[PDB]
Design an enzyme around this catalytic site. Sequence first.
Site, PDB file in Angstrom:
ATOM      1  CG  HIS A  12      -2.147  -1.157   0.940  1.00  0.00           C
ATOM      2  ND1 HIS A  12      -2.894  -1.337   0.066  1.00  0.00           N
ATOM      3  CD2 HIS A  12      -1.942  -2.026   1.816  1.00  0.00           C
ATOM      4  CE1 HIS A  12      -3.423  -2.449   0.341  1.00  0.00           C
ATOM      5  NE2 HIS A  12      -3.115  -2.953   1.310  1.00  0.00           N
ATOM      6  CE  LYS A  41      -3.954  -6.840  -2.093  1.00  0.00           C
ATOM      7  NZ  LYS A  41      -4.944  -5.693  -2.256  1.00  0.00           N
ATOM      8  CG  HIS A 119      -6.964  -4.221   6.550  1.00  0.00           C
ATOM      9  ND1 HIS A 119      -6.918  -5.119   5.431  1.00  0.00           N
ATOM     10  CD2 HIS A 119      -7.851  -3.572   6.843  1.00  0.00           C
ATOM     11  CE1 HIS A 119      -8.222  -4.908   4.961  1.00  0.00           C
ATOM     12  NE2 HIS A 119      -8.607  -3.862   5.988  1.00  0.00           N
ATOM     13  CG  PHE A 120      -5.711   0.645   2.196  1.00  0.00           C
ATOM     14  CD1 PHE A 120      -6.701   0.759   1.440  1.00  0.00           C
ATOM     15  CD2 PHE A 120      -4.983   1.863   2.417  1.00  0.00           C
ATOM     16  CE1 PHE A 120      -7.328   2.056   1.137  1.00  0.00           C
ATOM     17  CE2 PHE A 120      -5.405   3.048   2.151  1.00  0.00           C
ATOM     18  CZ  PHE A 120      -6.385   3.061   1.413  1.00  0.00           C
ATOM     19  CG  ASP A 121     -11.555  -1.366   6.418  1.00  0.00           C
ATOM     20  OD1 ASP A 121     -11.184  -2.555   6.148  1.00  0.00           O
ATOM     21  OD2 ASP A 121     -12.417  -0.892   6.665  1.00  0.00           O
TER      22      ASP A 121
END
Length: 124
Positions: A12, A41, A119-121
């Site tokens: 990210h 992905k 984590h990228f939400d």
Amino acid sequence: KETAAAKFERQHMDSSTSAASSSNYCNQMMKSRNLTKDRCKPVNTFVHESLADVQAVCSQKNVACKNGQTNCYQSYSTMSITDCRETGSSKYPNCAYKTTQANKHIIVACEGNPYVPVHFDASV
């Protein structure tokens, strides 16, 4: 094994560019960051900010994650981001993405000591 924090950086962060420079940005970065190695992905976001500025989001506005977890935080400020999503033609191993540049707040999940993104939400 790779830590969750390290995975977040690889997936990210792009502190090396201020924005996507071309329509091929996602194609090249998804490949280079190994996000297409085993499968394409489907969606990914890159953040064009310093690492410290993104890590600092873990001290910003708490908000529940999409999945309900309570360790998510929204940035107070908008950030330069690139959204990457598979094109209709994407087909492993020739993974293909649409690059969209935006300036949005980010939402990340954080864990650890130091308390950092894992984590990228969402971009919002």
